[PDB]
Amino acid sequence: SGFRKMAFPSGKVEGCMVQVTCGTTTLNGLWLDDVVYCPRHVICTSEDMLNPNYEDLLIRKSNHNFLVQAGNVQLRVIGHSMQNCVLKLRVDTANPKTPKYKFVRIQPGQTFSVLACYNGSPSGVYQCAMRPNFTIKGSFLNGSCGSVGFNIDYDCVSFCYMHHMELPTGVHAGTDLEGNFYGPFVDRQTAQAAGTDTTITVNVLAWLYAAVINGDRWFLNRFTTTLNDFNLVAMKYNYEPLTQDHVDILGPLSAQTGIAVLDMCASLKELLQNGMNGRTILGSALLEDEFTPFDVVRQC
Amino acid sequence: SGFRKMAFPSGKVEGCMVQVTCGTTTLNGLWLDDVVYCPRHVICTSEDMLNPNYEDLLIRKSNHNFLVQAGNVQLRVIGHSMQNCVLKLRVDTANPKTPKYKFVRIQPGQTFSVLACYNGSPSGVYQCAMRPNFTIKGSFLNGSCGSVGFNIDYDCVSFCYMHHMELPTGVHAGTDLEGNFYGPFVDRQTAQAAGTDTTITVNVLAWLYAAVINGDRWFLNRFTTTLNDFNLVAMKYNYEPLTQDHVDILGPLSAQTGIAVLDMCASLKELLQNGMNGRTILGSALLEDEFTPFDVVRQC
């Protein structure tokens, strides 16, 4: 028992992280087979970032303008291509530690593990969720660009995020591994800001089920509610709408605990209306929304 | 920026985890050089656990009574020894992926990363702190015994924890890697329970500094306090005493932010006395005490 925000073991990803330098900019790259993936803004100067034309900037680079370092061994770049906001650097050596992998784009509300790296060297691993406004609340310092987010399934690493930038609110924005941004963000200097966010309701319910599985039951009640009547109170507190699909996904957790989904919804409605009253749930004094139903079943 | 509960990259430890079976019990072992370390209760039946004499139980075992599996490759056990509450199984093959490592015992209040494994297979990684009452609030299911806790320094893995048992409150107890329990717990079935816990004050102050470094300043005030006057209010709320050593350790964080330690203490005193008033600090609605001063400097 116990419930922790838990990341996937990172070893399979650590063996893919390399250092990529272009000019005076150094950041992280992902080395899979004979390709290294990194943010395309590695080719940019601070002056370019104001209004870059990446097609123009890249046609002016040579293979030798990219220094790739895998620990000690330097990787010879034998070609380069742009794919949306990611650069693909073909190197003359296939990474001998390439795991079985896939590039998967995730949905707002789903979680992934982030391996934060600097100069190609992994520093830490932590779990995040893709927010409804397509930002992530990560922990990233200067030099973290190119760090990746991933899930693991059996032996297969599903890469879903590459880090590109920090927004003015301190939240983070990036792309999938095909180079396509999450959300309406761009890799240039603009006034862009995160939109208004909402709470991931299905995740809050999953986490309340985790609490029950762990013997935390004080927030339960005998009342129930309809899906409609719940969603009227959800909207009022900036919660995402709950759908029948979400109810169905919560089925297994409902079965294991014997608490119907709309019964749990009645508990959540009271928690929203009365607050927590100096009590905690699974060690937190607020309603946690960065655990998916899968995360709960996996840990419990 | 951003602040997350962040574990060390686990790859170096994943390569050391193996499966150890004795009789009908299966759990995890740590494979370093030609030795596999695991909880000695692996040799126990449920009847033995009531009042085991481990010296007697082990003299009755042979090398062939221990099945060690490193992924597929089975490890031939060529000798065994007991070291306190850990069993040491000499195997005929030295782990080719043995990292540079040390066995270090930690203090209450310090943190470490836990690699939770099952059947020798890593499942997740998360950060924990050693509580003042020598328990940890982990996330462990049946079969997690033998999972290890560690810190990483440069290239050196400092192992500090092996998981042995769950206490009735759902918290966890284990040993250092020399087999010596943290706290007054034993590896047999008794009425043992965690003692009363306290909050790690120096860590709360470190985390308030993390908040300031990240632009969260609402809890600050212009008031100050003496160490003595702080510690009178600390005791009242079940906080550990703050010492001049703790003030000195917080020096760098005080310098980076320009906020004196006893100034931060005045803010903490007001937070304890008035509560948080529906506001959050670094995304939490309670005072977080599982980040050391080192953890803050490392992430910030």
Numbering used by the authors:
A (entry chain A), B (entry chain A): 1 to 300
Question: What does the paper behind this entry write?
Answer:
Besides, SARS-CoV-2 VOCs carry mutations at varying frequencies in the Mpro that are specific to Alpha, Beta, Gamma, Lambda, and Omicron. where Alpha, Beta, and Gamma have the substitution K90R, Lambda has the substitution G15S, and Omicron has the substitution P132H. To elaborate on the impact of the G15S, K90R, and P132H mutations on the structure of Mpro, the apo-form structures of G15S, K90R, and P132H were determined at 1.77, 1.66, and 1.82 Å resolution, respectively. There is only one protomer in an asymmetric unit in each crystal structure, and all 1–301 residues could be traced in the electron density map. The mutant residues 15 and 90 are located in domain I and residue 132 is located in domain II. All these mutations are far away from the catalytic pocket; thus, it is reasonable to speculate that the G15S, K90R, and P132H mutations do not directly affect the architecture of the catalytic pocket. G15S, K90R, and P132H showed merely a slight difference from WT, with average root-mean-square deviation (RMSD) values of only 0.54 Å, 0.52 Å, and 0.58 Å, respectively, indicating that all these three mutations had a limited impact on the apo structure of Mpro. The mutation of the amino acid at position 90 from lysine to arginine results in the breaking of a hydrogen bond from lysine to the water molecule but does not significantly alter the conformations of surrounding residues. The catalytic efficiency (kcat/Km) values were determined to be 2.66 × 104 M−1s−1 for G15S, 3.05 × 104 M−1s−1 for K90R, 2.64 × 104 M−1s−1 for P132H, respectively, which are comparable to 2.71 × 104 M−1s−1 for WT. It is indicated that the G15S, K90R, P132H, and WT have similar enzymatic kinetic parameters and the impact of the three substitutions on Mpro could be neglected.
